[PDB]
DNA sequence: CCGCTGCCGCGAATTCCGTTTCAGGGTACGCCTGATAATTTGCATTTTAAATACCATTTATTGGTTACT
């Protein structure tokens, strides 16, 4: 759908294409993400 | 036949500060079924317009008349 429209799809249009209610799509989008490692260097210098 | 090379380990200052909390894998689909997580009623304890059943010590009405502008 992104290559067809040439941009990113809004959740409403995506919901239209999957034939599912908007809230279901939103719930899946928020569930999807995976946890972040506690050792990721947040400081530019790899100290902190 | 006890010498030298070559591997692999190990280590390299101190506080603060700053900052974008941030992204990237490229693989299917439709059944039965039990398995929870939702939703529906009744029964224990309060709290009940109040209603109720006794003790209580402290003014109220009081018992008014005998003196007298």
Swiss-Prot record:
Secretion signal, residue range per the UniProt entry: none
Assembly information from the UniProt record: Interacts transiently with the RNA polymerase catalytic core formed by RpoA, RpoB, RpoC and RpoZ (2 alpha, 1 beta, 1 beta' and 1 omega subunit) to form the RNA polymerase holoenzyme that can initiate transcription. Identified in a complex containing RpoD, the RNA polymerase subunits RpoA, RpoB and RpoZ, CRP and DNA. Interacts with Rsd; this prevents interaction with the RNA polymerase catalytic core and with promoter DNA, and as a consequence, promotes transcription from promoters that require alternative sigma factors. (Microbial infection) Interacts with Escherichia phage lambda antitermination protein Q.
Name of this chain's protein: RNA polymerase sigma factor RpoD
Free-text function comment from the UniProt entry: Sigma factors are initiation factors that promote the attachment of RNA polymerase to specific initiation sites and are then released. This sigma factor is the primary sigma factor during exponential growth. Preferentially transcribes genes associated with fast growth, such as ribosomal operons, other protein-synthesis related genes, rRNA- and tRNA-encoding genes and prfB.
Annotated segments matching region Sigma-70 factor domain-3: 1-48
Span of the entire protein shown here: 470 to 517 of 613
Family named by the database record: Belongs to the sigma-70 factor family. RpoD/SigA subfamily.
Domain statement: Contains 4 domains, connected by flexible linkers. In the active conformation, the domains are in an extended conformation, each making extensive interactions with the RNA polymerase catalytic core. In the autoinhibited state, sigma-70 factor domain-1 packs closely together with sigma-70 factor domains-2 and -4, contrary to the extended conformation that is seen when the protein is part of the RNA polymerase holoenzyme.
Compartments it resides in: Cytoplasm
Lineage: Bacteria, Pseudomonadati, Pseudomonadota, Gammaproteobacteria, Enterobacterales
Native organism: Escherichia coli (strain K12)
């Amino acid at each position: 759908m992104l290559q067809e429209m040439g941009r990113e799809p809004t959740p409403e249009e995506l919901a239209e294409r999957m034939l599912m209610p908007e809230d279901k799509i939103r719930k899946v989008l928020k569930i999807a993400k995976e946890p972040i490692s506690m050792e990721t260097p947040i400081g530019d210098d790899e100290d902190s």
